[PDB]
Design a protein around this ligand. Structure first.
Ligand code: LMN
Ligand code: PTY
Ligand code: FE
Lengths: 90, 75, 262, 26, 488, 122
């Protein structure tokens, strides 16, 4: 049993990301790193399923979701930077 | 009777004068665009009727296909 | 040839003409509104003359497609029951215009325009032979009367009376609309000539009758919902009270005569 | 009219929506 | 080989036009000869022209949308539903661009990248409607989400705009993560991502033998993500705050465009994802809760934009009534409601933007509007009554036919909730009409007259709203044609 | 004699947030927010209407403890508006609403402290 472990690890990563978004409502940076943790967990799901089913439709999707995750990081950090400037606090 | 050309022309003149009223201007501020609006309204009404006829024909064809597909369930 | 189309289009033209007339020309607005009302009244009187009184079939029938499959359509017709209601609702409007003749300089064009829209919407109510569109014109009268009660009210109480009237009318309206929808789904159409020849099951008759009674009893106050009529009557202009007492109280009785009882 | 019909009517006690709509901030 | 691209000229044109506009703006905004011209209106007009030209390309080429369908099969699927949805989306985008012209001049919004980002979001939604795969749908959703995150915080110096953008980005990223986890769980259970394959693999085993935990969980997660996207409660975490803090021209676009495409995706998911009527229950509860919460929350609003946001939530619930009843007459009611709601929302936001030049914030601000501008008050009252659903107006037809569809499937509980919510909505809509005409405030606020674009848009939409019942046949015909084409 | 404008002139001491005390002039019968608007302490474009429903405590003021007894008690609407915009859902126990304080000749010399400005554009 290895598919079970691979899915359980990513499920726990997803749960941790959701917890970080929920628990750390006061801090903005944690609310971005938790989203990135969730994206990492989903990408791991797609790659593991692609290897398990012997299909290339999960690897293409993981590569294409890396771009979305990076662009979300960029836009979120820009928005945070401009947000701190205006109100002077987080 | 009430043709699409006359109702379209009336709607175009009405919308032009409605736009003029909304901007606190006199109703017949620019007389030429009233004529332009009448022409555009007539064209739009005629095109709407012409499109409605074809749309109903296509809907009838699609519904005939759907009924034919459903009727085959009994075989 | 005088038909139901012209009788309904006359107030429409009257309201459209006044819509684009400068408010400074107070004399012209009053003259055109009064002339339109009088022409509509004469049209109704002529419609009386050519009315056959030996046939139960609807007369002067007119049709206009509403749904793409002709399921529901604008069916206009009059019978010996709704003819005098049409004549009365066209006769009362010129009187309402003449009531506010002296003070019309303050009300403006929106007064006569509101009354003409009221006439247009009430002529169609007594002439509709489609159950759904009878509801559409049945409850379209709220907006002109809401404006009449609120804008040209007497005291500050005009806001409360308008709210009460509008709320009661909505409560009746939607509970009747549910019954209309149930009839449409089961029967398949909303034509009166078809709904009068469809054998409704005994169980569904009580529910539909109660739902119809809910909307009609408000507009013909029986007992528990007669608390809006006095306030609306008192908090209304002199001509506004004539509409509420002369016509708007005849919707419930006509609704019972035309739909519920058959 | 002014009593039971009004209190159980639309504004004697049906105005609890003010005490109900304002609570939607929760 | 070049003729295989006849199916993507409407998208190729808009992409290339956006590139040309970006080059033009960046070259001439940072120029010394012209003294750094504020060419936001220029780029706006050229973008509106580009939208009209791609509308001409897309509408005229109707028989050519199925060309090379085998070659493009794995990428996207174009059909009659996609054709009309895309045409409506382009029309809404053009209307929003027309409304936002006055915003660039009076308030001096000189950033031309706003129009470029709007065009890119439009391209993303065009790719979204025709998307026939989980991958394509997710990518288009992310593209439009980023284009909206950037423009939500366009007002950098504003406290509300930055917070609104941050909340929007966090909520959208969380929803995208949930949706994407659902897609992963579906892919790992069926091995397929194409909608045809995912329909053939799920249409037979209708939970007849056992409930597949992975498939059920993936369907539920996709539904939850989509419900976040349309902001149906309890997934309306920060939607009113986002709508309030966002710029008004921005709020106009997010209230219309992101809903058409997302509803198209939800329909193209229902065509295959009808697994044991699981979504029908979820959408049933979501629609009831959305109507109730919108009705009970818009009565406690004193600002115009928060009331518009809660109206949008209530109308989303009213539309989801159609989702809860899966039938041709349910999907048709849903599409008619979407169309009418989009037109009413465009009308209302054009009215709001007309008064935004004088900084309108509260409902009491528009108190003496019936005296200063006695025709704008009439137009706004007409729009409010259309929101309420008064019979004579066009807003009644959508609610009427949605209630008919709800009663068709036999859901009597939905009809009662819809009726009560309609009563409450009508009350808080006529409350606004009371302020304009019946109140006599001591202090008046005088507004400056609007421009030609918004005046024409208001006139056309107001003539549509009042006179829709007279000739409603084309809308019903096209909607019935679209609903049938979802399957054949 | 005759009716003078000075017969309804209310002298007030308004302290802007940085601790400077300047004397403002108001009219007895008009809101204290109007009196503050004359000099420019409160931006007139933020509170154009002197009405309770068109307010988000953009006219909030801090009245002196000894100068609060000669004023009408806070109504339910005033408290509700004050609590929501506090950004902390707390009551200062000495903060009133400018649009709900009507000047009176018995308010001669009332000391009012204007807090810091808050965003109101959208
Ligand atoms: C908002 C205003 C409300 C006004 C409506 C009430 C006033 C009544 C006039 C409504 C009006 C204009 C629509 C106005 C559009 C609004 C403006 C939009 C914005 C503009 C700024 C349409 O009204 C008719 O149109 C018919 C459609 O053809 C429909 O009949 C149904 O059709 C079947 C379907 O297939 C159904 O199966 C079936 O059940 C019905 O038979 C009905 O809708 C109706 O009879 C008037 O009719 C006008 O269109 C046609 C007649 O047809 C006339 O020309 C035609 O051209 C060719 C056909 O292309 C024909 O070859 C040609 O022979 C013919 O001469 C015109 O000269 C004029 O008469
Ligand atoms: C539907 C119910 C029936 C309604 C009636 C329909 C009748 C048919 C239409 C009749 C229209 C009559 C209008 C008269 C013609 C006047 C046009 C002149 C406009 C013009 O000269 O261009 C400049 C502005 O452009 C403009 O003003 C262009 C404004 C276009 C706004 C909308 C653009 C298309 C959006 C897609 C449709 C809308 C959404 C639908 C889903 C004017 O410049 P200036 O001198 O005034 O000064 C700077 C202001 N900028
Ligand atoms: Fe205030």
């Amino acid at each position: 049993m290895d598919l079970i472990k691979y899915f359980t690890f990513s499920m726990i990563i997803f749960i941790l990301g959701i917890w970080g978004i929920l628990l750390n409502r006061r801090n903005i940076l944690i609310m971005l790193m938790s989203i990135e943790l969730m994206l990492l967990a989903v990408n791991l799901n797609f790659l593991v399923f692609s290897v398990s089913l012997d299909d290339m439709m999960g690897q293409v999707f993981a590569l294409l979701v890396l771009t979305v995750a990076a662009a979300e990081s960029a836009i979120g950090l820009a928005i945070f930077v401009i947000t701190f400037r205006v109100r002077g606090t987080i | 009777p009430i043709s699409a050309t006359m109702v379209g022309a009336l709607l175009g003149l009405g919308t032009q004068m409605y736009s003029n009223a909304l901007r606190k201007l006199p109703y017949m501020r620019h007389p030429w665009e009233h004529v332009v609006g009448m022409g555009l309204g007539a064209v739009f009404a005629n095109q709407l009727v012409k499109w409605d006829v074809k749309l109903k024909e296509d809907l009838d064809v699609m519904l005939a296909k759907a009924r034919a597909a459903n009727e085959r369930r009994y075989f | 040839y005088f038909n139901l189309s012209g009788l309904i289009l006359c107030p429409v033209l009257g309201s459209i003409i006044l819509l684009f007339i400068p408010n400074s020309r107070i004399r012209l607005i009053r003259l055109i509104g009064l002339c339109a009302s009088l022409i509509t009244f004469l049209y109704s009187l002529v419609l009386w003359i050519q009315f056959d009184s030996s046939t139960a079939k609807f007369q002067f029938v007119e049709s206009l497609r509403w749904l793409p499959y002709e399921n529901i359509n604008f069916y206009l017709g009059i019978d010996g029951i709704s003819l005098f209601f049409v004549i009365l609702t066209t006769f009362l409007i010129p009187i309402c215009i003449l009531v506010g003749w002296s003070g019309m300089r303050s009300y403006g064009k929106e007064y006569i325009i509101a009354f003409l829209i009221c006439e247009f919407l009430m002529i169609a109510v007594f002439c509709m032979l489609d159950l759904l569109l009878f509801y559409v014109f049945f409850e379209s009268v709220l907006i002109p009367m809401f404006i009449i009660i609120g804008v040209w009210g007497s005291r500050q109480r005009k806001i409360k009376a308008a709210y009460q009237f509008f709320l009661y009318t909505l409560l009746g309206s939607l509970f009747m609309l549910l019954a209309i929808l149930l009839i449409l789904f089961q029967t398949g159409t909303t034509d009166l000539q078809i709904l009068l020849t469809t054998e409704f099951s005994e169980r569904r008759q009580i529910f539909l009758w109660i739902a119809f009674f809910a909307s009609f009893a408000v507009k013909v106050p029986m007992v528990p919902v007669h608390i809006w009529l006095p306030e609306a009557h008192v908090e209304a202009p002199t001509a506004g009270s004539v509409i509420l007492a002369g016509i708007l109280l005849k919707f419930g009785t006509y609704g019972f005569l035309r739909f519920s009882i058959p | 009219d002014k009593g039971a019909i009004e209190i159980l009517g639309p504004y004697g006690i049906s105005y609890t929506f003010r005490r109900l709509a304002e609570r939607i901030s929760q | 080989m070049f003729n295989l691209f006849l199916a993507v000229f409407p998208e190729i044109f808009i992409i290339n036009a956006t590139f040309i506009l970006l080059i033009h703006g960046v070259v001439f905004s940072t120029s010394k000869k012209y003294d750094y011209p504020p060419l936001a209106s220029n780029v706006g007009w050229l973008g509106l022209l580009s939208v009209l030209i791609t509308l001409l390309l897309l509408a005229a080429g109707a028989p050519l949308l199925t060309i090379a369908h085998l070659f493009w099969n794995n990428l996207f699927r174009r059909d009659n539903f996609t054709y009309f949805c895309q045409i409506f989306l382009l029309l809404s985008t053009a209307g929003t661009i027309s409304m936002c012209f006055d915003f660039f001049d009076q308030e001096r919004f000189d950033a031309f990248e706003f129009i470029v980002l709007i065009l890119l979001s439009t391209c993303g939604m065009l790719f979204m409607i025709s998307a026939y795969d989980l991958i394509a749908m997710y990518l288009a959703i992310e593209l439009q989400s980023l284009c909206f995150y950037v423009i939500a915080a366009s007002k950098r110096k504003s406290e509300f705009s930055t917070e609104a953008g941050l909340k929007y980005l966090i909520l959208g990223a969380f929803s995208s993560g949930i949706l994407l986890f659902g897609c992963s769980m579906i892919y790992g259970s069926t091995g397929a991502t194409h909608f045809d394959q995912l329909a053939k693999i799920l249409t037979g085993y209708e939970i007849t033998g056992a409930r597949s935990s992975g498939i059920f969980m993936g369907i539920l997660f996709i539904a939850v993500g989509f419900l976040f996207k349309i902001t149906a409660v309890p997934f309306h975490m920060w939607a009113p705050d986002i709508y309030e803090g966002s710029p008004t021209p921005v709020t106009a676009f997010l209230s219309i465009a992101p809903k058409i495409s997302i509803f198209a995706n939800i329909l193209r998911v229902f065509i295959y994802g009808s697994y044991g009527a699981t979504l029908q229950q979820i959408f049933f509860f979501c629609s009831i809760a959305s109507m109730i919460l919108g009705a009970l929350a818009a009565m406690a609003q004193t600002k115009v934009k928060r009331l518009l946001a809660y109206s949008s939530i209530g109308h989303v619930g009213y539309i989801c009534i159609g989702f809860s009843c899966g039938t041709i007459e349910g999907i048709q009611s849903l599409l008619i409601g979407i169309f009418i709601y989009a037109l009413m929302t465009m009308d209302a936001f054009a009215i709001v933007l007309a008064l935004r030049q004088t900084r309108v914030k509260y409902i009491a601000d528009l108190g003496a509007l019936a005296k200063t501008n006695p025709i704008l008050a009439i137009t706004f009252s007409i729009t409010m009554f259309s929101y309420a659903g008064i019979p004579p107006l066009a807003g009644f037809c959508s609610k009427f036919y949605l209630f008919f569809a709800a009663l068709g499937c036999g859901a009597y509980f939905l009809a009662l909730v819809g009726v009560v919510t309609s009563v409450i909505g009508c009350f808080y809509y006529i409350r606004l009409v009371k302020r304009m005409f019946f109140d006599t405030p001591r202090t008046w606020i005088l507004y400056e007259p609007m421009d030609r674009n918004k005046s024409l848009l208001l006139a056309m939409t107001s003539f549509f709203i009042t006179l829709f019942l007279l000739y409603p046949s084309p809308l019903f015909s096209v909607t019935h044609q679209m609903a049938l084409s979802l399957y054949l | 004699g005759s009716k003078k404008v000075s017969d309804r002139i209310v002298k007030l001491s308004a302290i802007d947030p940085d601790g400077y005390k300047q004397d403002i002039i108001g009219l007895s019968g008009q809101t204290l927010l109007r009196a503050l608007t004359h000099t420019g302490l409160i931006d007139p474009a933020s509170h154009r209407l002197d009405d309770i429903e068109a307010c988000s405590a953009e006219c909030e003021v801090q009245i002196a403890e000894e100068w609060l007894e000669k004023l009408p008690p806070r109504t339910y609407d005033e408290e509700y508006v004050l609590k929501r915009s506090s950004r902390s859902r707390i009551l200062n126990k000495h903060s009133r609403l400018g649009c709900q304080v009507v000047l009176t000749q018995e308010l001669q010399g009332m000391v009012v402290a204007v807090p810091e400005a808050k965003p109101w554009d959208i």
